[PDB]
């Protein structure tokens, strides 16, 4: 970088060979970056089981402190981003739905582009490993909160989001912190919202067949079919306390994830029970013996679901 910049307007004739063995040291970048992605693939797929208390494989610690070894070569990284594709770190049979990525302009583009693509590779390979290790007879189907296949979307969700807890808690104080501005934050956000929505999935089942249970008996009269009262409201309480029950298995670590999953699933549930509670709270002198919660107290349950 210092020599090809040095002073120009002059004869410079080994400059070609500078670009040729520097073309081989961009095969050291290039090979070090396909090495980075394949490093994620093999070094990740080293492990086989989700941990005892289901934490974070320290191959990811290796991956992120590996990235801070990519950090402090910073200006040589900047020049080292020269004239080279996204597909120069890609196993080409991928899909771009794997990559939360939405230009070709400078090396600051390929900075956040490249590194955040590497953490997307971390996402798809960790995700794949969970998809294997919980249903060991199936196809790993990926990036799918709408999956009709997984039974562990909460569990995989808390696992992966502890891995991302690690990743942004090394981009906490990094130079990557100051490197990967703009989009890559939001790339990390979409990365989160995948597994977040995995932990909203069966809550969307509860709300789903709740308002579907509004829909199928939206035909006739007021509920003289009081099996529909205790169907919707009882089974709503059943699945609600199932979801609160399996919420207890996981105890979050980012406060903003507590705010995130909290306000997400609040915004998922509430207006259904608002118009629906308030629609059907006119059926007994004691609806108490059939319908249990207010939105006040259910809101309070959610607000101390998040200790």
């Amino acid at each position: 970088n210092d020599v090809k910049k040095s002073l120009r307007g002059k004869e410079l004739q080994n400059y070609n060979l500078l670009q040729d063995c520097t073309q081989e040291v961009r095969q050291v970048t290039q090979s070090l970056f396909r090495d980075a992605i394949d490093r994620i693939i093999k070094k990740a797929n080293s492990i086989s089981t989700i941990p005892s208390n289901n934490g974070v494989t320290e191959a990811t610690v290796d991956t992120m402190s590996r990235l801070r070894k990519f950090s402090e070569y910073k200006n040589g990284c900047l020049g080292a981003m020269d004239n080279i594709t996204r597909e120069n770190w890609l196993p080409s049979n991928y899909k771009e739905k794997e990559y939360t990525l939405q230009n070709w302009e400078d090396h600051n583009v390929l900075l956040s582009c490249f590194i955040s693509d590497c953490i997307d590779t971390l996402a798809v390979n960790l995700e794949r490993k969970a998809q294997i290790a919980l249903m060991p007879n199936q196809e790993p189907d990926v990036a799918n909160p709408n999956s009709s296949k997984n039974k562990h979307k909460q569990r995989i969700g808390f696992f992966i989001l502890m891995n991302l807890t690690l990743v942004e808690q090394i981009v906490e104080k990094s130079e990557l912190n100051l490197m990967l501005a703009g989009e890559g934050h939001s790339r990390l956000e979409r990365l989160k919202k995948r597994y977040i929505s995995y932990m909203v999935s069966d809550w969307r089942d509860l709300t789903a067949n709740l308002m579907d249970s509004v829909f199928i008996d939206s035909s006739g009269k007021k509920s003289k079919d009081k099996e529909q009262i205790k169907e919707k409201f009882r089974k709503f309480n059943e699945g609600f306390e199932d979801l609160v029950s399996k919420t207890k298995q996981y105890k979050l670590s980012d406060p903003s994830l507590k705010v995130t999953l909290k306000s997400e699933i609040i915004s998922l549930v509430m207006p259904m029970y608002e118009r629906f509670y308030s629609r059907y709270k006119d059926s007994f002198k004691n609806p108490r013996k059939h319908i249990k919660y207010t939105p006040d107290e259910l809101t309070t349950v959610l607000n101390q679901l998040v200790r």
Binding site: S52, N53, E58, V61, S65, R68, I170
Partner: protein
């Protein structure tokens, strides 16, 4: 909530804290007598034993407001649990209190 949330409650993520190497720098020399393993030989049962201390002390605490005070002035009923004089009728008092 937190104290139960340290027993199995990771307490390994705390090991993941310095097992982020505190990178930078490069090591990764974590030789903490890890850690607080802990307590599975009955000290966890000492912890839950203390929790039985707490909810037990609340149980005898509000259970002192079971006698009304047995119907009447046993008013300074600060200690202790006895004397089930079962004259249930009437007011003055099943009240407690």
């Amino acid at each position: 909530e937190h104290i139960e949330k340290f027993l199995d409650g990771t307490y390994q993520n705390s090991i993941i804290n310095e097992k982020r190497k505190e990178n930078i720098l490069i090591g990764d020399s974590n030789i903490i007598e890890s850690y607080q393993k802990s307590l599975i030989l009955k000290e966890e049962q000492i912890n839950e034993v203390r929790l039985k201390g707490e909810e037990f002390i609340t149980s005898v605490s509000q259970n002192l407001i079971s006698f009304f005070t047995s119907s009447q002035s046993s008013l300074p009923s600060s200690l202790k649990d006895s004397t089930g004089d079962i004259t249930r009728s009437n007011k003055d008092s099943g009240s407690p209190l």
